[PDB]
Structure 1
Amino acid sequence: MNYFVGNSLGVNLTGIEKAIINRLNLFKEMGRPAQCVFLSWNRYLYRNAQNYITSSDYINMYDFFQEATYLERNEPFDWLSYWTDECHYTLKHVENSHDFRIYDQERFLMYAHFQDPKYRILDYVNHFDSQRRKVKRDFYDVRGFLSCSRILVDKQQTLCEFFYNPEGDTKLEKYFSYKDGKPEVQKIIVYYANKQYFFNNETELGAFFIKQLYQHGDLFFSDRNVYTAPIFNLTPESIPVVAVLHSTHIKNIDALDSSPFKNVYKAMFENLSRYRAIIVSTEQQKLDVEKRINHTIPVVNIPVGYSETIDTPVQTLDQRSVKLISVARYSPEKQLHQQIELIKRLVSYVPKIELHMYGFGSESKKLNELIQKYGLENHVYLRGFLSNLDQEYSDAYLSLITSNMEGFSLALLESLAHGVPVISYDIKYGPNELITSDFNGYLITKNDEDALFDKVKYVIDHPEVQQRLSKGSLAKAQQYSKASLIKQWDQFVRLI
Structure 2
Amino acid sequence: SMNYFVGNSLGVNLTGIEKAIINRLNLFKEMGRPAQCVFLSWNRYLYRNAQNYITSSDYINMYDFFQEATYLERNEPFDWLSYWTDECHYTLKHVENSHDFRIYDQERFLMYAHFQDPKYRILDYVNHFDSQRRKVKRDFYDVRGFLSCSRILVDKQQTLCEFFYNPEGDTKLEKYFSYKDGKPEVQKIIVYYANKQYFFNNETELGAFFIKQLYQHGDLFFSDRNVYTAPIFNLTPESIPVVAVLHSTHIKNIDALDSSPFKNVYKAMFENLSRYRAIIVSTEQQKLDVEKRINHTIPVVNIPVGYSETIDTPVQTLDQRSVKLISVARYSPEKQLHQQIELIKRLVSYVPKIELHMYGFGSESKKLNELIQKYGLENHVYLRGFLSNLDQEYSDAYLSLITSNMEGFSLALLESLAHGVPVISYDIKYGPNELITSDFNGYLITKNDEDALFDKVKYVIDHPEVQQRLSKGSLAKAQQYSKASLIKQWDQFVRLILEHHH
Give 1:223 shift: 0.8
Give 1:72 shift: 1.2
Number of residue equivalences:
496
Distance in 2 (CA, whole Å) between partners of 1:371 and 1:309 is 36
Give 1:8 shift: 1.4
Q: 1:88 to 1:333 in 2, by over 3 A?
A: farther
The answer to whether the Cα contact below 8 Å between 2:285 and 2:433 also exists between their aligned partners in 1 is no
Q: TM-score, normalised by structure 2?
A: 0.88
Q: 1:388 to 1:44 in 2, by over 3 A?
A: farther
Give 1:48 shift: 1.7
Give 1:172 shift: 1.2
Give 1:447 shift: 4.3
Match of 1:396, SS state, is coil
Distance in 2 (CA, whole Å) between partners of 1:339 and 1:92 is 57
Distance in 1 (CA, whole Å) between partners of 2:350 and 2:144 is 53
Root-mean-square deviation (Å): 3.2
Q: 1:383 to 1:93 in 2, by over 3 A?
A: farther
**Aligned residue for 1:307?**
308
Give 1:13 shift: 1.6
Distance in 2 (CA, whole Å) between partners of 1:72 and 1:63 is 11
Match of 2:349, SS state, is coil
Q: 1:140 to 1:291 in 2, by over 3 A?
A: same
Q: 1:447 to 1:134 in 2, by over 3 A?
A: farther
Q: Any unmatched runs of 5+ in structure 1?
A: none
Q: Give deviations 1:373-402, integer Å, cap 9, x for gaps.
A: 999888777767665544453344443434
Match of 2:384, SS state, is coil
Q: Give deviations 1:298-331, integer Å, cap 9, x for gaps.
A: 1111111222232333333465455554444555
Distance in 2 (CA, whole Å) between partners of 1:361 and 1:114 is 31
Distance in 1 (CA, whole Å) between partners of 2:325 and 2:93 is 49
Distance in 1 (CA, whole Å) between partners of 2:198 and 2:317 is 61
Match of 2:77, SS state, is coil
Give 1:242 shift: 1.0
Distance in 2 (CA, whole Å) between partners of 1:403 and 1:87 is 62
The answer to whether the Cα contact below 8 Å between 1:248 and 1:405 also exists between their aligned partners in 2 is no
Q: Give deviations 1:416-435, integer Å, cap 9, x for gaps.
A: 12222233332101112211
Give 1:232 shift: 0.5
Q: 1:401 to 1:173 in 2, by over 3 A?
A: farther
Q: 1:42 to 1:273 in 2, by over 3 A?
A: same
Q: TM-score, normalised by structure 1?
A: 0.88
Give 1:136 shift: 1.8
Give 1:84 shift: 4.4
Distance in 2 (CA, whole Å) between partners of 1:363 and 1:163 is 43
Moved more, 329-338 or 426-435: 329-338
Moved more, 53-62 or 207-216: 53-62
Give 1:274 shift: 0.4
Distance in 2 (CA, whole Å) between partners of 1:373 and 1:386 is 26
Give 1:234 shift: 0.8
The answer to whether the Cα contact below 8 Å between 1:124 and 1:138 also exists between their aligned partners in 2 is yes
Distance in 2 (CA, whole Å) between partners of 1:319 and 1:416 is 21
Give 1:406 shift: 2.5
Match of 1:35, SS state, is strand
Distance in 1 (CA, whole Å) between partners of 2:391 and 2:206 is 41
- Give identity over the alignment, percent: 100
Q: Give deviations 1:79-99, integer Å, cap 9, x for gaps.
A: 344444444444444444434
Distance in 2 (CA, whole Å) between partners of 1:93 and 1:434 is 57
Match of 2:319, SS state, is coil
Distance in 1 (CA, whole Å) between partners of 2:81 and 2:480 is 56
Moved more, 396-405 or 142-151: 396-405
Give 1:355 shift: 5.7
Moved more, 195-204 or 478-487: 478-487
Distance in 1 (CA, whole Å) between partners of 2:131 and 2:96 is 25
Give 1:162 shift: 1.5
Give 1:292 shift: 1.0
Distance in 2 (CA, whole Å) between partners of 1:428 and 1:13 is 24
Q: 1:91 to 1:259 in 2, by over 3 A?
A: same
Distance in 2 (CA, whole Å) between partners of 1:360 and 1:165 is 41
Give 1:455 shift: 4.9
Moved more, 196-205 or 82-91: 82-91
Give 1:341 shift: 6.8
The answer to whether the Cα contact below 8 Å between 1:186 and 1:200 also exists between their aligned partners in 2 is yes
Give 1:452 shift: 4.8
**Aligned residue for 1:102?**
103
Distance in 2 (CA, whole Å) between partners of 1:371 and 1:100 is 49
Distance in 1 (CA, whole Å) between partners of 2:311 and 2:340 is 28
Q: Any unmatched runs of 5+ in structure 2?
A: 498-502
Q: 1:359 to 1:158 in 2, by over 3 A?
A: farther
Give 1:249 shift: 0.6
Moved more, 315-324 or 17-26: 315-324
Structure with bigger gyration radius = 2
Q: Give deviations 1:237-285, integer Å, cap 9, x for gaps.
A: 1111111111111001011112101101111111111011111111121
The answer to whether the Cα contact below 8 Å between 2:420 and 2:471 also exists between their aligned partners in 1 is yes
Match of 2:391, SS state, is coil
Give 1:108 shift: 3.4
Distance in 2 (CA, whole Å) between partners of 1:321 and 1:91 is 62
Give 1:109 shift: 3.2
Q: 1:360 to 1:222 in 2, by over 3 A?
A: farther
Q: 1:147 to 1:412 in 2, by over 3 A?
A: same
**Aligned residue for 2:229?**
228
**Aligned residue for 2:479?**
478
Give 1:169 shift: 1.6
